Amino acid sequence: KIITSESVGAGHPDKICDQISDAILDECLSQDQNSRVACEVLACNRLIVIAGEITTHAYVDVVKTAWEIIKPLGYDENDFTIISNVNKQSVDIAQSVDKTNKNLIGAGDQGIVFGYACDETPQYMPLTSVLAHELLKEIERQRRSKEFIKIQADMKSQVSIDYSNSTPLIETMLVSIQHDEDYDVEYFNKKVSAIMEQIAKKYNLNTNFKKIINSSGRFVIGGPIGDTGLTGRKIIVDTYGGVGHHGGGAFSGKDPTKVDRSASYFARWIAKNVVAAKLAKQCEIQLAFAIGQPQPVAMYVNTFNTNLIDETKIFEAIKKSFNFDIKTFINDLNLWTTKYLPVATYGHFGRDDLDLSWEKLNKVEDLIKNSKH
Amino acid sequence: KKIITSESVGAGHPDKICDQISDAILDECLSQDQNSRVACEVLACNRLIVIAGEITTHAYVDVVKTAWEIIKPLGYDENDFTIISNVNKQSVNLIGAGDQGIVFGYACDETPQYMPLTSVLAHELLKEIERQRRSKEFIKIQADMKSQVSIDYSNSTPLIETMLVSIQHDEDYDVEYFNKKVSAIMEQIAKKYNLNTNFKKIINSSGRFVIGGPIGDTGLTGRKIIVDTYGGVGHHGGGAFSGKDPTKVDRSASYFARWIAKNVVAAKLAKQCEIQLAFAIGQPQPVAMYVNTFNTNLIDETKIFEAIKKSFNFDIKTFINDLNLWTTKYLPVATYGHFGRDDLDLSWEKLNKVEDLIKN
Ligand SMILES: Nc1ncnc2c1ncn2[C@@H]1O[C@H](COP(=O)(O)OP(=O)(O)OP(=O)(O)O)[C@@H](O)[C@H]1O
Numbered sequence: 001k002i003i004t005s006e007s008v009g010a011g012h013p014d015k016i017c018d019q020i021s022d023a024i025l026d027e028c029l030s031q032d033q034n035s036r037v038a039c040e041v042l043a044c045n046r047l048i049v050i051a052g053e054i055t056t057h058a059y060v061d062v063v064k065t066a067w068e069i070i071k072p073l074g075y076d077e078n079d080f081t082i083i084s085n086v087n088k089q090s091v092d093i094a095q096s097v098d099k100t101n102k103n104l105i106g107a108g109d110q111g112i113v114f115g116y117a118c119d120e121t122p123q124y125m126p127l128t129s130v131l132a133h134e135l136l137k138e139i140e141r142q143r144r145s146k147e148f149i150k151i152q153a154d155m156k157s158q159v160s161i162d163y164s165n166s167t168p169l170i171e172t173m174l175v176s177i178q179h180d181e182d183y184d185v186e187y188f189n190k191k192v193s194a195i196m197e198q199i200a201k202k203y204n205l206n207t208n209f210k211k212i213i214n215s216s217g218r219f220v221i222g223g224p225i226g227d228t229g230l231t232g233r234k235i236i237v238d239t240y241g242g243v244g245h246h247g248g249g250a251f252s253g254k255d256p257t258k259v260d261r262s263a264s265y266f267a268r269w270i271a272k273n274v275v276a277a278k279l280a281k282q283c284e285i286q287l288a289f290a291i292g293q294p295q296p297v298a299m300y301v302n303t304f305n306t307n308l309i310d311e312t313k314i315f316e317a318i319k320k321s322f323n324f325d326i327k328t329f330i331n332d333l334n335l336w337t338t339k340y341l342p343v344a345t346y347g348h349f350g351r352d353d354l355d356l357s358w359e360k361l362n363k364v365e366d367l368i369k370n371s372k373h
Numbered sequence: 374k375k376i377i378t379s380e381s382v383g384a385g386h387p388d389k390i391c392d393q394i395s396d397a398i399l400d401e402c403l404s405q406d407q408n409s410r411v412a413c414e415v416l417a418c419n420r421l422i423v424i425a426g427e428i429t430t431h432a433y434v435d436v437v438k439t440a441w442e443i444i445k446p447l448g449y450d451e452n453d454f455t456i457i458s459n460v461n462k463q464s465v466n467l468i469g470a471g472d473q474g475i476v477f478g479y480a481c482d483e484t485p486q487y488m489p490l491t492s493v494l495a496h497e498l499l500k501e502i503e504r505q506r507r508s509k510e511f512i513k514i515q516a517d518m519k520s521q522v523s524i525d526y527s528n529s530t531p532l533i534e535t536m537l538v539s540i541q542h543d544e545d546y547d548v549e550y551f552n553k554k555v556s557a558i559m560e561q562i563a564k565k566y567n568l569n570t571n572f573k574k575i576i577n578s579s580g581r582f583v584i585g586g587p588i589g590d591t592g593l594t595g596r597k598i599i600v601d602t603y604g605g606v607g608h609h610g611g612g613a614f615s616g617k618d619p620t621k622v623d624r625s626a627s628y629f630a631r632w633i634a635k636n637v638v639a640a641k642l643a644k645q646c647e648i649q650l651a652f653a654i655g656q657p658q659p660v661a662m663y664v665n666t667f668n669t670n671l672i673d674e675t676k677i678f679e680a681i682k683k684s685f686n687f688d689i690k691t692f693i694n695d696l697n698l699w700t701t702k703y704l705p706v707a708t709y710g711h712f713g714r715d716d717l718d719l720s721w722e723k724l725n726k727v728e729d730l731i732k733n
């Protein structure tokens with residue numbers, strides 16, 4: 001039984017787009033917390049089109065902001081044309097979300113979001129996901145600091161784990177990194193091999209696993225240059241690298257009124273606190289929404305027969321422990337005042353390197369109280 | 374109370390406009406050159422449609438002309454959009470995987486389509502509404518529209534909890550007429566799968582939907598990957614299908630995985646079957662395979678793994694030829710799901726491996 005997860009670096013075309021989308025969002029929320037943002041980005045060859053709907057009192061040069069994401073990766077003013085066709089939000093959607101009564105907020109769209117957690121890691125995330133991110137996250141750190149030279153930002157990881165026996169085993173770690181023409185392969189493979197082992201030993205896993213380093217054998221042309229990138233085409237890499245289910249919504253470039261995002265975060269927060277409360281080893285939460293309605297239309301809790309108390313009492317504890325009003329859980333998770341660029345890379349979930357509201361175990365003591373009466 | 378929910382989107386949905394244009398361009402390429410490489414992405418923002426991606430082909434393709442053929446049927450005319458192309462174009466051992474990646478194949482016995490009830494009902498609802506719009510049996514509505522069907526799986530006979538529909542309408546619609554027409558289509562669909570008829574109906578919950586299409590939303594290729602597949606009941610690896618030729622395992626392996634799952638459940642070896650396949654760039658066979666029967670297996674789990682290995686060739690060039698992916702039209706699957714198409718005749722939906730799975 002082999003389960004596999006993937007991640008992509010800051011220089012991946014899709015992740016360039018996700019970063020530019022959240023960077024524009026962050027710049028909007030800083031000035032106007034009441035601003036509606038649905039920012040999509042196409043990066044095709046040397047053309048970057050910034051698009052979507054934005055209504056805001058904020059002054060934002062969308063193009064200037066794109067260049068600030070792009071120079072670090074590190075392209076210059078000669079590398080791209082960057083044009084904006086950014087429109088305004090539909091007044092038809094706005095009337096349904098922003099009520100006349102100032103006290104409810106209605107769902108930004110219809111949709112289904114999944115929240116997942118498990119006890120396999122301190123991050124309460126599947127091992128394969130954590131290892132795939134941490135690998136690229138360490139490589140990108142060394143590239144910016146020049147501890148790992150003659151590599152560029154574009155890169156991918158795939159970590160396969162053999163779950164046959166109850167103690168997990170690393171089967172394969174795969175890495176593709178964009179490199180310079182004049183790289184030393186010895187140096188390159190040693191650097192990658194060392195990072196792969198340092199990471200395996202961190203989660204005290206076997207160290208003898210198969211290492212697949214630049215399997216294509218040439219990776220100089222990266223980024224959008226041969227290629228295409230769009231906002232929200234890495235939604236499984238943003239979440240639970242499979243292991244969990246997904247409803248289809250992308251996160252980057254969307255303000256908190258888009259339930260696709262804020263409800264997904266809210267769902268992560270329940271799942272994580274349920275497993276942290278030791279009520280289950282794995283927990284998946286499905287939430288469904290209707291456009292303009294203030295509360296979820298349907299909710300499903302699945303503990304995968306890893307529940308350590310009665311399944312039914314877990315459903316009750318959650319209903320008693322969490323407010324499901326959309327304006328309320330948005331304020332509770334402080335989504336108006338959270339910077340989203342940091343989660344545009346290396347996953348939205350299990351960020352022990354960040355301090356995200358939806359990762360805090362501040363509901364464990366309420367779930368324990370409400371599972372018993 | 375166990376409530377599972379799936380959604381679908383109509384042909385006029387911005388993302389699905391993009392998926393249609395991407396597969397229409399693919400189809401136009403394969404028609405002339407079966408050896409052509411196509412990775413076509415489309416942005417539709419306000420009145421600008423940008424067609425982009427990589428194409429190597431001997432085929433003559435007016436990418437812009439093809440986009441207009443998808444768009445005119447939906448309402449729009451030559452005055453409604455600017456349509457520009459930035460598509461990068463070129464001329465041209467056995468075949469290795471187009472990329473690394475993970476693909477999931479799912480099947481179950483809940484429907485004749487071997488697909489989750491929530492998915493089938495969500496598609497069939499929009500598929501019937503779109504039919505009546507073109508035939509003018511349902512007037513003063515436009516092509517952009519969404520469905521959400523929630524089913525209560527508590528007891529062993531499934532029960533409709535909620536049907537949701539948003540349809541873009543004209544300024545001068547009659548709400549009485551509109552709500553009656555939707556209510557009637559919702560019931561005729563429920564009765565088709567002989568389900569309860571008393572479920573909750575949510576019709577245009579926003580309360581105004583005149584501004585639709587890419588005006589007041591934005592649309593990209595491959596942002597409806599869960600609506601293209603198993604509407605949340607299955608797992609997904611992250612790859613979108615539309616605009617990609619068969620050498621992209623993301624697509625062809627996903628189809629190959631559907632074909633195993635469906636034939637496994639059709640063979641009566643399980644009620645539900647999920648197949649995970651993992652790939653390495655430049656490798657001719659899958660690197661890992663995982664089989665999940667959700668404890669609904671009717672033979673030993675281990676003997677199902679053996680039967681599949683004996684019953685199917687996992688060479689990527691071989692399963693591409695076996696499923697005839699070079700000669701398959703993909704535009705029809707750009708709307709209303711890639712899987713459980715009893716309204717189409719797809720190679721990866723054929724139960725032509727049941728007798729081989731039983732033998733092995
Ligand atoms: N006034 C309105 N009332 C109701 N629905 C609307 C209105 N305006 C637009 N919509 C619908 O909202 C949809 C949003 O599409 P979609 O579900 O793709 O969300 P998104 O924010 O574009 O991101 P993603 O595609 O990742 O979900 C539009 O395509 C349209 O069908």
Ligand SMILES: Nc1ncnc2c1ncn2[C@@H]1O[C@H](COP(=O)(O)OP(=O)(O)OP(=O)(O)O)[C@@H](O)[C@H]1O
Pocket residue numbers: 012013014154155156176215216217218219221222223227228229233234472474595611612613623654
């Ligand atoms: N020589 C190479 N070897 C390995 N990987 C490469 C090579 N050249 C490019 N790549 C990687 O392959 C990627 C293209 O495939 P990828 O699956 O990442 O596409 P995507 O658009 O992100 O995904 P999807 O369309 O399935 O949502 C490039 O962005 C790059 O990261």
